[model samples]
Target: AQYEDGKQYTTLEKPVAGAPQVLEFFSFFCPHCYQFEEVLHISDNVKKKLPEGVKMTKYHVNFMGGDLGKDLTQAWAVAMALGVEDKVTVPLFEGVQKTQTIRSASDIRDVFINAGIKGEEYDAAWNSFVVKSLVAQQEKAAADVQLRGVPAMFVNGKYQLNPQGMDTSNMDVFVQQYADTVKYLSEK
Candidate 1:
């Protein structure tokens, strides 16, 4: 995969053991994250390159939107549980980052409503045990990683990719390098 230690990635002190997976810690309120997914399409591209048996999970971190950050995380969990990320994520990012129109959980609900999901369904998913568990796990992961930034990613829960170390001279190179790193670590 053409990577070097402490360069393209950092080996975790306490490695999380389990399946071969990639966990992405992101925030809709983060401009870099918006650009990473909406502009550069990093996650989508990375997913395409992952080897068989490897999966990707995106976790919304509750550290960016202040008092609303937790709400945002929960909202994302609801979206995932309901299979509506394509409907909720981009618009949420636009409202939270680009347009600055979203303000409260009600505003987030509007996004779900616009996606054709019933308000009642949204409410149920918002408070569902599965969604709540997902949110709790994300919070625990953030703390476990000592997370201090947006758009952080870990491969196999052990190798944390150094986004800054990636070859970002252009979009293709950046995506390739990022995917290659994850692919490499997943195989390890």
Candidate 2:
């Protein structure tokens, strides 16, 4: 499970310092990302087994462009800013994937409100400087990686893992293997 830069995952020109900075790049509008929700639901189960140094977070990608993309991407940073990703992610995924909605900022915001975040609380993060700054960082990171699609995983900002045709049964195996890869790099 050694993190062979060119083999296990695509290697970055520059390896990041924090070896386990696992960034899951996804989009709210992506059905595959929405489907990955099942895998995400069980993340904690595998995350608990990861070495203390290993950590993962989401980077909401703007794939569709225009207002729809802007808002959902901002909403993601907003939720992260509000410290409500664990609660809002699944609901938002279903909001788009199952409900076949979330066509605007208002619709996207409703996803947060439905999750119980106060209007003022969500609004503050939605347009605040922090969320905007984070959005810029997100965009930069995505470009830096030359991202190809949603549901892609980046290890320490230096390696990318794209999960294809994944299901619940193999989810654990996938995560464990990545966790092992992270552990391998942390040791090197």
Candidate 3:
């Protein structure tokens, strides 16, 4: 859907022709999203079990109110824009989670550099239109949707899944529910 600012909230304005689509609304600083990472990976693997024409794209929520929170959001946007998401997202998450130290732009940049993204490319993408636009859009989304928290999922623009109500104690069960939800949505 398009934001009031006239910017598209989704990269794909419509469903991918014949493909079933899943959109995950998340945040980098959210502990739940981090914990859900393994589930998400397993869900991705389960794509093989899908009938066909199924795809998932994660959208990171970056406008949660703190400077560090917003910065991490921008970092995720930069990774997405630069096509270094697979290269940097997990490592960046690890870097942020493992350190008892402060998480700063420099720390994130170091993670990206360690992940093989050139320092210059990283800098440029961090400041690129895509990242800037995504950040702005995220802020607008938070205001427009009045979202309470992260790790929200939207399926084919019809179904919404909130993990907060699920059996989160068993990570595998949480993941299985997520996969099952996706499968159910795909068939609809």
Instruction: Give all TM-scores, in the order shown.
Output: 0.94, 0.81, 0.75
Clashing residue pairs, backbone N/CA/C < 3 A, model 2: none
Off by over 4 Å in 3: 1-20, 39-52, 63-65, 140-145, 168-170
lDDT of 1 by residue, 10-127 (tens): 9888887662378888998887899887878988888888755567788899879897788999999998898888888888998898888899999999988998999999999998
The superposed Cα distance between candidate 1 and the true structure at residue 139, in angstroms, equals 0.6
Better of 1 and 3 by TM-score: 1
Q: lDDT winner among the candidates?
A: 1
Q: For candidate 2, lDDT tens digit of each residue in 1-188?
A: 44445655666677655443767788877876775675544246436756665677778888764678878888888988889898788777777777767677898788788889999989888879999998997888788777778767776666665344222367567666655554454344
- Cα lDDT of model 3 by residue, 1-188, tens digit: 11211121212233333322665667666776676663456446446556676676666665553676677778878877887778876776666664523267788788888889899998998888888997776565444444567766655664556454455677667667656656665566
lDDT of each: 0.85, 0.71, 0.63
Clashes of 1: 0
Instruction: Tell me model 3's lDDT, rounded to 2 decimals.
Output: 0.63
Cα RMSD for candidates in order: 1.5, 3.1, 7.7
